[PDB]
Amino acid sequence: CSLTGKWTNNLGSIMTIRAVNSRGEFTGTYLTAVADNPGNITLSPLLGIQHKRASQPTFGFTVHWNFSESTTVFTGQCFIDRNGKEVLKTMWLLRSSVNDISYDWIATRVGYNNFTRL
Amino acid sequence: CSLTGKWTNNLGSIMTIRAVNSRGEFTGTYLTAVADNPGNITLSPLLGIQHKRASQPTFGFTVHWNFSESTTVFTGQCFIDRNGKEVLKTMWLLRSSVNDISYDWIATRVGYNNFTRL
Amino acid sequence: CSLTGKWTNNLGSIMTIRAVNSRGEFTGTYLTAVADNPGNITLSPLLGIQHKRASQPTFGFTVHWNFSESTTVFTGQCFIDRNGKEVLKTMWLLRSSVNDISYDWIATRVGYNNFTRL
Amino acid sequence: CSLTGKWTNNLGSIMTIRAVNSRGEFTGTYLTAVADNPGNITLSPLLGIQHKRASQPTFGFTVHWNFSESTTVFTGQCFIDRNGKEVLKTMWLLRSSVNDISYDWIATRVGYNNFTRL
Ligand SMILES: O=C(CCCC[C@@H]1SC[C@@H]2NC(=O)N[C@@H]21)Nc1ccc([N+](=O)[O-])cc1
Ligand SMILES: O=C(CCCC[C@@H]1SC[C@@H]2NC(=O)N[C@@H]21)Nc1ccc([N+](=O)[O-])cc1
Ligand SMILES: O=C(CCCC[C@@H]1SC[C@@H]2NC(=O)N[C@@H]21)Nc1ccc([N+](=O)[O-])cc1
Numbered sequence: 022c023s024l025t026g027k028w029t030n031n032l033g034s035i036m037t038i039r040a041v042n043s044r045g046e047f048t049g050t051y052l053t054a055v056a057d058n059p060g061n062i063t064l065s066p067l068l069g070i071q072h073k074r075a076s077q078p079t080f081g082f083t084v085h086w087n088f089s090e091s092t093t094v095f096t097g098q099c100f101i102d103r104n105g106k107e108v109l110k111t112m113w114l115l116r117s118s119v120n121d122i123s124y125d126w127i128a129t130r131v132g133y134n135n136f137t138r139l
Numbered sequence: 140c141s142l143t144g145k146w147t148n149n150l151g152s153i154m155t156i157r158a159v160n161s162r163g164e165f166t167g168t169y170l171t172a173v174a175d176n177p178g179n180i181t182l183s184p185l186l187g188i189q190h191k192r193a194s195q196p197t198f199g200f201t202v203h204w205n206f207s208e209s210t211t212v213f214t215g216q217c218f219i220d221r222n223g224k225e226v227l228k229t230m231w232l233l234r235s236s237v238n239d240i241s242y243d244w245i246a247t248r249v250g251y252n253n254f255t256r257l
Numbered sequence: 258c259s260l261t262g263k264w265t266n267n268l269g270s271i272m273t274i275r276a277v278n279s280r281g282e283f284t285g286t287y288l289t290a291v292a293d294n295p296g297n298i299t300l301s302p303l304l305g306i307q308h309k310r311a312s313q314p315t316f317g318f319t320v321h322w323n324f325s326e327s328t329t330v331f332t333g334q335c336f337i338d339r340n341g342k343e344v345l346k347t348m349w350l351l352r353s354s355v356n357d358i359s360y361d362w363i364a365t366r367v368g369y370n371n372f373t374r375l
Numbered sequence: 376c377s378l379t380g381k382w383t384n385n386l387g388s389i390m391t392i393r394a395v396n397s398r399g400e401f402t403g404t405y406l407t408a409v410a411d412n413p414g415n416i417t418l419s420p421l422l423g424i425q426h427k428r429a430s431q432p433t434f435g436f437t438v439h440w441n442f443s444e445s446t447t448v449f450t451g452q453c454f455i456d457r458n459g460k461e462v463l464k465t466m467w468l469l470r471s472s473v474n475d476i477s478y479d480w481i482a483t484r485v486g487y488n489n490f491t492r493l
């Protein structure tokens with residue numbers, strides 16, 4: 022349950038995460054399989070923090086989409102089953118860019134993602 | 140709309156964001172006014188990314204609570220009003236640590252926060 | 258804290274709730290101040306249930322928009338302050354209609370609303 | 376994609392929904408497989424509205440838990456695949472009862488559920 026490594030989710034997206042430092046911080050790269058405009062998809066950086074001591078840590082990360090003005094955050098927990106298989110159970114918020122504060126109500130989508138190791 | 144500086148929210152929490160780098164990455168600290176167990180609250184680190192080009196950027200950040208096994212992620216947009224006042228409109232997910240995957244359904248809280256500058 | 262009566266929220270929307278029955282069921286109407294296409298807004302029906310015994314009951318309701326294929330659900334709690342003023346604190350999910358299951362990930366928005374009496 | 380009938384979800388919960396009327400309104404009964412205190416689980420009524428014309432309608436419903444002061448709302452869309460199999464793709468908010476308005480921030484959980492016909 023070090024987030025380091027390569028993962029895929031139920032939508033077919035993949036992400037790679039680099040070494041987790043002593044503070045639990047990590048960087049990585051996210052390839053979404055889906056977007057509002059999938060023709061525009063490019064690789065997008067992520068940055069987050071996990072807990073370090075827990076065997077099944079909670080964590081969060083931000084994805085700065087490099088092809089959109091939007092941002093997504095993911096949070097979840099890494100679980101290990103009887104056979105040692107890891108799953109990241111996550112929920113996310115996807116924030117759209119709107120023109121002014123009077124449109125704020127329409128700007129936040131929610132969903133889930135389950136990730137397993139590639 | 141650089142997130143650098145000190146901010147307070149509607150619950151009375153305060154966060155301090157350091158320099159935003161050329162990628163839009165930032166670190167800082169978060170002092171929550173509230174918690175499951177407020178007697179345990181300690182200053183906690185945050186790490187996130189904002190968009191750089193946009194005058195009213197979207198952003199995300201993760202708070203690793205230093206007194207809990209939980210994690211929060213925030214995402215939102217920084218708006219500049221006609222008088223130049225900045226407001227962060229955010230939504231958040233708070234992930235609790237549970238014992239095993241059968242409890243995953245109970246583990247994610249959602250809410251909002253509006254921040255203005257200190 | 259009977260939801261019967263007229264209420265307004267922070268976005269300026271108004272809803273009117275009819276008699277709450279002995280099960281806590283209620284119907285009413287909802288006039289949203291905002292929409293994807295505000296030129297199309299029409300008064301829309303709502304249907305929900307509140308708890309009956311509690312002085313500060315939790316509740317939920319569904320709004321079937323009469324001008325959209327979307328649906329919103331609201332859930333929250335009615336609080337009575339020390340002066341007897343009632344506030345509904347709510348969160349909502351707004352479900353859009355998409356063409357097929359491959360688009361399901363894009364279809365759910367989240368937000369808040371605070372209501373007070375008219 | 377009439378919600379009428381018997382359904383189960385990914386957590387093992389079941390629900391039965393009665394006839395949907397001409398306004399799209401329906402009642403039913405929900406048996407959750409999980410709860411904060413599963414020893415207390417009893418059958419709980421639901422009340423909601425679906426859209427009528429759409430082949431793959433959106434909908435919402437409220438579950439008034441009969442063993443808790445909490446309430447859940449579900450919203451989603453009913454999809455039909457090439458072989459005629461129905462799936463309800465839903466997101467939910469679970470509202471807890473808290474003592475006063477200053478605890479409101481902790482009171483709303485979010486998640487998903489996928490339902491198929493029994
Ligand atoms: O499309 C985008 C950017 C890419 C988002 C991919 C999401 S992240 C949650 C989910 N999990 C995945 O692995 N991938 C999806 N942004 C966007 C979408 C819609 C709108 N809009 O205005 O409707 C604006 C920006
Ligand atoms: O209490 C905690 C850790 C601190 C969370 C503070 C939240 S972050 C969203 C909101 N905005 C703020 O400025 N402050 C609040 N975690 C926690 C809470 C509940 C449970 N639980 O099991 O119920 C477990 C851990
Ligand atoms: O616009 C709509 C229908 C009206 C929704 C009003 C929302 S209910 C939550 C909030 N509280 C209020 O009082 N009013 C707002 N639906 C819609 C919106 C966006 C999209 N979309 O595709 O982006 C599709 C349908």
Ligand SMILES: O=C(CCCC[C@@H]1SC[C@@H]2NC(=O)N[C@@H]21)Nc1ccc([N+](=O)[O-])cc1
Nearest residue numbers: 386388407409410411440443445447467471
């Ligand atoms: O436990 C409860 C009542 C039952 C909730 C069942 C949920 S509905 C979303 C999900 N889908 C299912 O089919 N079943 C689950 N309420 C509750 C839970 C936690 C707390 N709390 O304070 O932590 C208070 C009330």
